[model samples]
Target chain A: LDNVATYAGQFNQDYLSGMAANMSGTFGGANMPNLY
Target chain B: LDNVATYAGQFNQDYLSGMAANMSGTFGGANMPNLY
Candidate 1:
Protein backbone atom coordinates (compact mmCIF):
# COMPACT_ATOMS: atom_id res chain seq x y z
CA LEU A 1 0.00 0.00 0.00
CA ASP A 2 2.79 2.38 0.90
CA ASN A 3 4.57 1.47 -2.29
CA VAL A 4 1.40 1.95 -4.32
CA ALA A 5 0.87 5.40 -2.83
CA THR A 6 4.44 6.39 -3.57
CA TYR A 7 4.13 5.10 -7.12
CA ALA A 8 0.91 7.00 -7.62
CA GLY A 9 2.47 10.27 -6.49
CA GLN A 10 5.50 9.77 -8.67
CA PHE A 11 3.33 8.79 -11.61
CA ASN A 12 1.24 11.93 -11.22
CA GLN A 13 4.30 14.15 -11.07
CA ASP A 14 5.82 12.52 -14.13
CA TYR A 15 2.58 12.72 -16.11
CA LEU A 16 1.99 16.37 -15.27
CA SER A 17 5.56 17.39 -16.01
CA GLY A 18 5.45 15.56 -19.32
CA MET A 19 2.17 17.25 -20.21
CA ALA A 20 3.59 20.67 -19.33
CA ALA A 21 6.64 20.05 -21.41
CA ASN A 22 4.58 18.92 -24.39
CA MET A 23 2.24 21.90 -24.18
CA SER A 24 5.02 24.41 -23.76
CA GLY A 25 7.00 22.94 -26.59
CA THR A 26 4.07 22.96 -28.97
CA PHE A 27 2.39 26.24 -28.01
CA GLY A 28 5.27 28.31 -26.68
CA GLY A 29 6.16 28.61 -23.04
CA ALA A 30 4.39 31.96 -22.72
CA ASN A 31 1.10 30.31 -23.54
CA MET A 32 1.49 27.52 -21.08
CA PRO A 33 -1.24 27.51 -18.45
CA ASN A 34 -0.50 28.02 -14.76
CA LEU A 35 -1.92 24.62 -13.97
CA TYR A 36 0.48 23.79 -11.22
CA LEU B 1 5.28 17.99 -35.34
CA ASP B 2 3.44 14.85 -36.35
CA ASN B 3 5.68 12.76 -34.16
CA VAL B 4 5.14 15.16 -31.30
CA ALA B 5 1.41 14.92 -31.65
CA THR B 6 1.53 11.16 -31.77
CA TYR B 7 3.77 11.08 -28.74
CA ALA B 8 1.45 13.40 -26.87
CA GLY B 9 -1.53 11.21 -27.59
CA GLN B 10 0.33 8.09 -26.54
CA PHE B 11 1.53 9.78 -23.38
CA ASN B 12 -1.98 10.88 -22.51
CA GLN B 13 -3.34 7.40 -23.01
CA ASP B 14 -0.62 5.82 -20.94
CA TYR B 15 -0.99 8.35 -18.17
CA LEU B 16 -4.77 7.95 -18.06
CA SER B 17 -4.64 4.15 -18.06
CA GLY B 18 -2.03 4.18 -15.32
CA MET B 19 -4.15 6.54 -13.26
CA ALA B 20 -7.20 4.36 -13.71
CA ALA B 21 -5.25 1.31 -12.66
CA ASN B 22 -3.94 3.04 -9.58
CA MET B 23 -7.35 4.31 -8.53
CA SER B 24 -9.14 1.04 -9.17
CA GLY B 25 -6.49 -0.96 -7.39
CA THR B 26 -6.64 1.30 -4.37
CA PHE B 27 -10.36 1.94 -4.16
CA GLY B 28 -12.02 -0.94 -6.01
CA GLY B 29 -12.98 -0.96 -9.67
CA ALA B 30 -16.66 -0.43 -8.93
CA ASN B 31 -15.93 3.01 -7.55
CA MET B 32 -13.87 4.12 -10.53
CA PRO B 33 -15.12 7.24 -12.27
CA ASN B 34 -16.34 7.27 -15.86
CA LEU B 35 -13.92 10.02 -16.74
CA TYR B 36 -13.16 8.73 -20.21
Candidate 2:
Protein backbone atom coordinates (compact mmCIF):
# COMPACT_ATOMS: atom_id res chain seq x y z
CA LEU A 1 0.00 0.00 0.00
CA ASP A 2 2.84 2.39 0.71
CA ASN A 3 4.23 1.59 -2.69
CA VAL A 4 0.92 2.38 -4.26
CA ALA A 5 0.83 5.63 -2.33
CA THR A 6 4.32 6.54 -3.47
CA TYR A 7 3.52 5.66 -7.04
CA ALA A 8 0.45 7.86 -6.98
CA GLY A 9 2.41 10.64 -5.31
CA GLN A 10 4.76 10.85 -8.27
CA PHE A 11 1.99 12.32 -10.40
CA ASN A 12 1.19 16.01 -10.33
CA GLN A 13 -2.18 17.17 -9.15
CA ASP A 14 -3.39 17.98 -12.67
CA TYR A 15 -2.42 14.61 -14.03
CA LEU A 16 -4.10 12.84 -11.14
CA SER A 17 -7.20 14.96 -11.66
CA GLY A 18 -7.29 14.07 -15.33
CA MET A 19 -6.93 10.40 -14.52
CA ALA A 20 -9.71 10.67 -11.96
CA ALA A 21 -11.95 12.26 -14.60
CA ASN A 22 -11.17 9.51 -17.06
CA MET A 23 -11.81 6.82 -14.50
CA SER A 24 -14.94 8.32 -12.98
CA GLY A 25 -17.13 6.80 -15.66
CA THR A 26 -16.05 3.30 -14.82
CA PHE A 27 -15.29 3.61 -11.10
CA GLY A 28 -18.43 5.57 -10.20
CA GLY A 29 -17.60 9.26 -10.03
CA ALA A 30 -15.00 11.15 -8.00
CA ASN A 31 -15.88 9.34 -4.83
CA MET A 32 -14.14 6.15 -5.86
CA PRO A 33 -12.83 3.81 -3.17
CA ASN A 34 -9.28 4.34 -1.97
CA LEU A 35 -7.12 1.52 -3.16
CA TYR A 36 -4.30 2.48 -0.83
CA LEU B 1 5.96 1.74 -11.27
CA ASP B 2 8.46 -0.77 -9.89
CA ASN B 3 7.20 -0.22 -6.39
CA VAL B 4 3.67 -1.03 -7.38
CA ALA B 5 4.85 -4.14 -9.14
CA THR B 6 6.82 -5.24 -6.13
CA TYR B 7 3.89 -4.52 -3.86
CA ALA B 8 1.58 -6.64 -5.96
CA GLY B 9 4.17 -9.39 -6.23
CA GLN B 10 4.35 -9.66 -2.45
CA PHE B 11 0.78 -10.97 -2.26
CA ASN B 12 0.31 -14.74 -2.28
CA GLN B 13 -1.61 -16.15 -5.21
CA ASP B 14 -4.57 -17.11 -3.05
CA TYR B 15 -4.75 -13.69 -1.47
CA LEU B 16 -4.53 -12.03 -4.82
CA SER B 17 -7.20 -14.33 -6.16
CA GLY B 18 -9.45 -13.45 -3.27
CA MET B 19 -8.86 -9.75 -3.81
CA ALA B 20 -9.69 -10.13 -7.47
CA ALA B 21 -12.91 -11.89 -6.60
CA ASN B 22 -13.84 -9.14 -4.18
CA MET B 23 -13.04 -6.42 -6.69
CA SER B 24 -14.64 -8.09 -9.71
CA GLY B 25 -18.04 -6.54 -9.17
CA THR B 26 -16.61 -3.03 -9.14
CA PHE B 27 -13.78 -3.53 -11.63
CA GLY B 28 -15.58 -5.51 -14.33
CA GLY B 29 -14.63 -9.07 -13.56
CA ALA B 30 -11.27 -10.82 -13.36
CA ASN B 31 -9.85 -8.87 -16.29
CA MET B 32 -9.33 -5.67 -14.44
CA PRO B 33 -6.85 -3.11 -15.73
CA ASN B 34 -3.17 -3.70 -14.91
CA LEU B 35 -2.46 -0.81 -12.60
CA TYR B 36 1.26 -1.45 -12.57
Candidate 3:
Protein backbone atom coordinates (compact mmCIF):
# COMPACT_ATOMS: atom_id res chain seq x y z
CA LEU A 1 0.00 0.00 0.00
CA ASP A 2 2.76 2.44 0.87
CA ASN A 3 5.28 1.33 -1.70
CA VAL A 4 2.99 1.37 -4.70
CA ALA A 5 3.84 3.42 -7.83
CA THR A 6 1.64 6.17 -9.38
CA TYR A 7 1.53 7.37 -12.96
CA ALA A 8 -0.49 10.34 -14.24
CA GLY A 9 -1.12 11.62 -17.78
CA GLN A 10 -3.03 14.77 -18.61
CA PHE A 11 -6.51 14.08 -19.97
CA ASN A 12 -6.47 16.49 -22.92
CA GLN A 13 -2.80 15.69 -23.42
CA ASP A 14 -4.14 12.69 -25.28
CA TYR A 15 -4.79 10.24 -22.46
CA LEU A 16 -6.90 8.22 -24.88
CA SER A 17 -4.56 9.23 -27.69
CA GLY A 18 -1.28 7.99 -26.20
CA MET A 19 0.36 11.33 -25.38
CA ALA A 20 1.30 10.23 -21.87
CA ALA A 21 4.99 9.82 -22.32
CA ASN A 22 6.00 11.17 -18.93
CA MET A 23 5.67 8.60 -16.21
CA SER A 24 5.92 10.16 -12.77
CA GLY A 25 7.22 8.72 -9.51
CA THR A 26 4.66 10.66 -7.47
CA PHE A 27 2.38 7.67 -6.94
CA GLY A 28 -0.75 9.72 -7.65
CA GLY A 29 -2.57 7.11 -9.67
CA ALA A 30 -0.98 4.32 -7.67
CA ASN A 31 -3.00 1.14 -7.86
CA MET A 32 -0.94 -1.43 -9.73
CA PRO A 33 -1.96 0.28 -13.00
CA ASN A 34 -5.67 -0.34 -12.68
CA LEU A 35 -7.95 1.14 -15.43
CA TYR A 36 -4.96 3.07 -16.69
CA LEU B 1 -0.23 20.44 0.19
CA ASP B 2 2.08 22.87 -1.59
CA ASN B 3 0.90 23.13 -5.22
CA VAL B 4 -2.29 21.19 -5.58
CA ALA B 5 -4.57 22.07 -8.52
CA THR B 6 -8.11 22.43 -7.22
CA TYR B 7 -10.68 21.27 -9.76
CA ALA B 8 -14.15 19.72 -9.82
CA GLY B 9 -14.76 16.13 -10.90
CA GLN B 10 -15.45 12.58 -9.87
CA PHE B 11 -14.86 10.87 -6.50
CA ASN B 12 -11.89 9.13 -8.07
CA GLN B 13 -9.70 12.14 -8.89
CA ASP B 14 -10.10 15.29 -6.82
CA TYR B 15 -7.69 15.67 -3.86
CA LEU B 16 -10.39 14.56 -1.45
CA SER B 17 -11.28 11.84 -3.91
CA GLY B 18 -7.83 10.40 -3.39
CA MET B 19 -8.49 10.25 0.33
CA ALA B 20 -12.03 8.89 0.16
CA ALA B 21 -11.09 6.45 -2.57
CA ASN B 22 -8.06 4.95 -0.85
CA MET B 23 -7.83 6.83 2.46
CA SER B 24 -4.42 8.34 1.63
CA GLY B 25 -2.82 11.64 0.58
CA THR B 26 0.15 14.09 1.07
CA PHE B 27 -0.39 13.85 4.85
CA GLY B 28 -1.94 10.43 4.65
CA GLY B 29 -5.04 11.51 6.57
CA ALA B 30 -3.29 13.56 9.22
CA ASN B 31 -6.07 16.02 10.33
CA MET B 32 -8.91 18.48 9.66
CA PRO B 33 -12.03 18.49 7.41
CA ASN B 34 -13.67 15.62 9.29
CA LEU B 35 -16.61 15.18 6.86
CA TYR B 36 -14.39 15.44 3.82
Candidate 4:
Protein backbone atom coordinates (compact mmCIF):
# COMPACT_ATOMS: atom_id res chain seq x y z
CA LEU A 1 0.00 0.00 0.00
CA ASP A 2 0.99 3.60 -0.53
CA ASN A 3 1.91 5.64 2.51
CA VAL A 4 0.49 8.72 0.88
CA ALA A 5 -3.28 8.93 0.82
CA THR A 6 -4.43 12.46 -0.20
CA TYR A 7 -1.97 15.11 0.74
CA ALA A 8 -1.50 18.65 -0.67
CA GLY A 9 0.99 21.45 -1.09
CA GLN A 10 0.47 24.91 0.47
CA PHE A 11 3.99 26.25 0.63
CA ASN A 12 5.42 28.97 -1.57
CA GLN A 13 8.77 29.87 -3.22
CA ASP A 14 9.56 32.12 -0.30
CA TYR A 15 9.38 29.36 2.30
CA LEU A 16 9.94 26.27 0.21
CA SER A 17 13.41 26.14 -1.36
CA GLY A 18 14.32 29.74 -0.70
CA MET A 19 13.88 29.71 3.02
CA ALA A 20 15.78 26.54 3.87
CA ALA A 21 17.15 24.44 0.98
CA ASN A 22 15.16 22.02 -1.12
CA MET A 23 12.02 19.96 -0.80
CA SER A 24 11.95 19.49 2.94
CA GLY A 25 15.52 20.58 2.45
CA THR A 26 16.28 18.60 -0.66
CA PHE A 27 14.05 19.06 -3.72
CA GLY A 28 11.84 21.84 -2.40
CA GLY A 29 9.39 19.33 -0.95
CA ALA A 30 7.72 19.43 2.45
CA ASN A 31 7.44 15.71 3.23
CA MET A 32 3.77 15.55 2.14
CA PRO A 33 1.61 13.91 -0.47
CA ASN A 34 0.09 15.07 -3.76
CA LEU A 35 -2.86 17.48 -3.90
CA TYR A 36 -4.43 16.19 -7.06
CA LEU B 1 -0.60 27.67 22.61
CA ASP B 2 0.86 24.66 20.90
CA ASN B 3 -1.26 21.56 20.49
CA VAL B 4 1.97 19.73 19.73
CA ALA B 5 3.15 18.68 23.15
CA THR B 6 6.01 16.87 21.45
CA TYR B 7 6.55 18.39 18.02
CA ALA B 8 4.04 17.43 15.31
CA GLY B 9 1.84 14.51 14.47
CA GLN B 10 4.41 12.20 16.02
CA PHE B 11 1.67 10.50 18.04
CA ASN B 12 -1.85 10.83 16.57
CA GLN B 13 -3.01 7.33 17.12
CA ASP B 14 -5.03 5.47 19.76
CA TYR B 15 -7.06 8.59 20.48
CA LEU B 16 -10.01 6.22 20.65
CA SER B 17 -8.69 2.70 20.05
CA GLY B 18 -7.26 1.09 16.93
CA MET B 19 -3.97 0.27 15.10
CA ALA B 20 -2.72 3.59 13.79
CA ALA B 21 0.78 2.95 15.17
CA ASN B 22 2.27 6.46 15.16
CA MET B 23 2.02 9.33 12.68
CA SER B 24 2.25 7.24 9.53
CA GLY B 25 -0.66 4.81 9.66
CA THR B 26 -3.42 7.22 10.57
CA PHE B 27 -6.47 8.94 9.04
CA GLY B 28 -6.29 12.56 10.04
CA GLY B 29 -8.51 15.36 8.68
CA ALA B 30 -7.05 18.63 9.86
CA ASN B 31 -3.89 20.37 8.63
CA MET B 32 -0.81 22.21 10.01
CA PRO B 33 -2.09 23.99 13.14
CA ASN B 34 -4.13 20.90 13.99
CA LEU B 35 -1.93 18.13 12.53
CA TYR B 36 -2.22 17.17 16.23
Candidate 5:
Protein backbone atom coordinates (compact mmCIF):
# COMPACT_ATOMS: atom_id res chain seq x y z
CA LEU A 1 0.00 0.00 0.00
CA ASP A 2 1.00 3.61 -0.55
CA ASN A 3 0.89 4.27 3.18
CA VAL A 4 3.45 1.53 3.85
CA ALA A 5 5.74 2.66 1.06
CA THR A 6 5.43 6.28 2.09
CA TYR A 7 6.13 5.49 5.72
CA ALA A 8 9.11 3.34 4.83
CA GLY A 9 10.53 6.11 2.65
CA GLN A 10 10.63 8.48 5.62
CA PHE A 11 11.51 5.82 8.19
CA ASN A 12 15.17 5.68 9.15
CA GLN A 13 17.02 2.62 7.93
CA ASP A 14 18.87 2.46 11.23
CA TYR A 15 15.55 2.17 13.08
CA LEU A 16 14.49 -0.70 10.89
CA SER A 17 17.84 -2.34 11.29
CA GLY A 18 17.50 -1.96 15.05
CA MET A 19 14.14 -3.70 14.97
CA ALA A 20 15.65 -6.59 13.06
CA ALA A 21 18.46 -6.60 15.56
CA ASN A 22 15.97 -6.89 18.41
CA MET A 23 14.48 -9.98 16.83
CA SER A 24 17.90 -11.51 16.54
CA GLY A 25 18.65 -10.51 20.10
CA THR A 26 15.39 -11.90 21.49
CA PHE A 27 15.53 -15.17 19.60
CA GLY A 28 17.95 -16.99 17.42
CA GLY A 29 17.19 -15.73 13.94
CA ALA A 30 19.06 -18.75 12.69
CA ASN A 31 15.83 -20.66 13.41
CA MET A 32 13.84 -18.16 11.39
CA PRO A 33 12.60 -19.00 7.95
CA ASN A 34 14.67 -17.55 5.17
CA LEU A 35 12.67 -18.04 2.01
CA TYR A 36 15.18 -15.95 0.18
CA LEU B 1 7.86 -3.96 24.31
CA ASP B 2 5.93 -0.89 25.40
CA ASN B 3 6.08 0.31 21.84
CA VAL B 4 4.16 -2.74 20.68
CA ALA B 5 1.58 -2.42 23.42
CA THR B 6 1.11 1.29 22.75
CA TYR B 7 0.79 0.79 19.03
CA ALA B 8 -1.66 -2.04 19.55
CA GLY B 9 -3.77 0.21 21.74
CA GLN B 10 -4.05 2.88 19.02
CA PHE B 11 -4.07 0.45 16.13
CA ASN B 12 -7.34 -0.91 14.83
CA GLN B 13 -7.78 -4.43 16.13
CA ASP B 14 -9.94 -5.13 13.12
CA TYR B 15 -7.09 -4.03 10.90
CA LEU B 16 -4.69 -6.41 12.64
CA SER B 17 -7.27 -9.17 12.69
CA GLY B 18 -7.71 -8.51 9.00
CA MET B 19 -3.98 -8.84 8.52
CA ALA B 20 -4.03 -12.19 10.29
CA ALA B 21 -6.91 -13.04 8.04
CA ASN B 22 -4.92 -12.01 5.01
CA MET B 23 -2.10 -14.35 6.02
CA SER B 24 -4.57 -17.18 6.39
CA GLY B 25 -6.14 -16.17 3.12
CA THR B 26 -2.78 -16.07 1.40
CA PHE B 27 -1.43 -19.22 2.98
CA GLY B 28 -2.39 -21.59 5.76
CA GLY B 29 -0.96 -20.47 9.11
CA ALA B 30 -1.22 -23.97 10.53
CA ASN B 31 2.26 -24.69 9.26
CA MET B 32 3.61 -21.69 11.14
CA PRO B 33 5.36 -21.88 14.50
CA ASN B 34 3.30 -21.81 17.66
CA LEU B 35 5.12 -20.05 20.43
CA TYR B 36 1.82 -19.29 22.05
Candidate 6:
Protein backbone atom coordinates (compact mmCIF):
# COMPACT_ATOMS: atom_id res chain seq x y z
CA LEU A 1 0.00 0.00 0.00
CA ASP A 2 0.96 3.63 0.31
CA ASN A 3 2.01 3.17 3.89
CA VAL A 4 5.65 2.66 3.00
CA ALA A 5 5.73 5.74 0.87
CA THR A 6 3.97 7.77 3.55
CA TYR A 7 6.31 6.54 6.22
CA ALA A 8 9.37 7.43 4.18
CA GLY A 9 7.86 10.78 3.26
CA GLN A 10 7.36 11.72 6.88
CA PHE A 11 10.87 10.72 7.78
CA ASN A 12 12.25 12.67 4.85
CA GLN A 13 10.21 15.69 5.79
CA ASP A 14 11.36 15.46 9.38
CA TYR A 15 14.97 15.27 8.32
CA LEU A 16 14.89 18.19 5.90
CA SER A 17 12.72 20.32 8.14
CA GLY A 18 14.67 19.46 11.22
CA MET A 19 17.90 20.77 9.75
CA ALA A 20 16.35 23.83 8.25
CA ALA A 21 17.60 27.25 9.37
CA ASN A 22 14.13 28.19 10.52
CA MET A 23 14.61 30.17 13.69
CA SER A 24 11.59 28.42 15.13
CA GLY A 25 13.18 25.02 14.62
CA THR A 26 16.07 23.58 16.51
CA PHE A 27 18.49 21.21 14.89
CA GLY A 28 17.83 17.54 15.58
CA GLY A 29 20.12 14.74 16.54
CA ALA A 30 19.73 13.34 13.08
CA ASN A 31 21.60 16.40 11.95
CA MET A 32 24.29 16.03 14.55
CA PRO A 33 26.58 13.42 13.04
CA ASN A 34 26.10 14.80 9.58
CA LEU A 35 26.76 18.38 10.61
CA TYR A 36 29.82 17.48 12.59
CA LEU B 1 -3.39 -3.24 4.12
CA ASP B 2 -1.11 -4.57 6.85
CA ASN B 3 1.70 -2.29 5.70
CA VAL B 4 1.28 0.11 8.60
CA ALA B 5 1.45 -2.62 11.20
CA THR B 6 4.42 -4.20 9.52
CA TYR B 7 6.23 -0.87 9.44
CA ALA B 8 5.60 -0.27 13.14
CA GLY B 9 6.72 -3.77 14.03
CA GLN B 10 9.97 -3.27 12.17
CA PHE B 11 10.54 0.06 13.93
CA ASN B 12 10.07 -1.54 17.33
CA GLN B 13 12.38 -4.37 16.49
CA ASP B 14 15.05 -1.92 15.36
CA TYR B 15 14.56 0.12 18.51
CA LEU B 16 14.71 -2.71 21.01
CA SER B 17 17.39 -4.49 19.11
CA GLY B 18 19.53 -1.36 18.75
CA MET B 19 20.15 -0.23 22.33
CA ALA B 20 20.46 -3.71 23.69
CA ALA B 21 23.43 -4.41 25.98
CA ASN B 22 24.53 -6.81 23.27
CA MET B 23 26.90 -4.03 22.13
CA SER B 24 26.40 -4.94 18.52
CA GLY B 25 24.22 -2.00 17.52
CA THR B 26 24.67 1.71 17.97
CA PHE B 27 21.91 4.05 19.05
CA GLY B 28 20.30 6.02 16.26
CA GLY B 29 19.40 9.64 15.74
CA ALA B 30 15.72 8.91 16.34
CA ASN B 31 16.68 7.76 19.79
CA MET B 32 19.07 10.63 20.52
CA PRO B 33 16.81 13.53 21.48
CA ASN B 34 14.45 11.12 23.20
CA LEU B 35 17.31 9.61 25.16
CA TYR B 36 18.81 12.94 26.09
Predicted candidate 6 versus true structure: per-residue lDDT over B1-36, tens digit per residue:
312211111211222222222111222233322333
Ranking by TM-score: 3, 4, 2, 6, 1, 5
Q: State every prediction's TM-score relative to the real structure.
A: 0.11, 0.13, 0.16, 0.15, 0.11, 0.12
Candidates' DockQ values? 0.04, 0.04, 0.04, 0.03, 0.03, 0.05
**lDDT for B22 (candidate 1):** 24
How far off is residue B1 in model 2, in Å? 17
Model 1 per-residue lDDT at A15: 34
lDDT of each: 0.24, 0.21, 0.27, 0.25, 0.18, 0.21
Report the lDDT tens digits of candidate 2 across residue range B13-34. Answer: 2212111211111222123333
Candidate 2 lDDT score relative to the true structure: 0.21
TM-score between predicted and true chain B, model 2: 0.12
Off by over 4 Å in 6: A1-36, B1-22, B31-36
Clashes of each: 0, 0, 1, 6, 0, 0
- CA-RMSD of model 1: 19.8
lDDT (tens digit, per residue) of candidate 6 on A1-36: 222211211121222212221111112133332322
Model 2 stretches with alpha carbons more than 4 Å out: A1-36, B1-8, B15-36
The C-alpha local distance difference test score for the whole of candidate 6 amounts to 0.21
* Candidates' chain B TM-scores in the order shown: 0.12, 0.12, 0.13, 0.14, 0.13, 0.13
Clashing pairs in 6: none
lDDT of 4 by residue, B1-36 (tens): 212111222222222322221221224233333232
Interface RMSD of 1: 19.8
Worst 10 residues of 6 chain A by lDDT: A5-14
The better candidate by DockQ, 2 or 4, is: 2
TM-score of chain A of 4: 0.16
lDDT (tens digit, per residue) of candidate 1 on A1-36 = 111111122332333322232221222111223332
Best-performing candidate as measured by DockQ: 6
- A1-36: candidate 5 lDDT, tens digit per residue: 111110111112221211221111111122333343
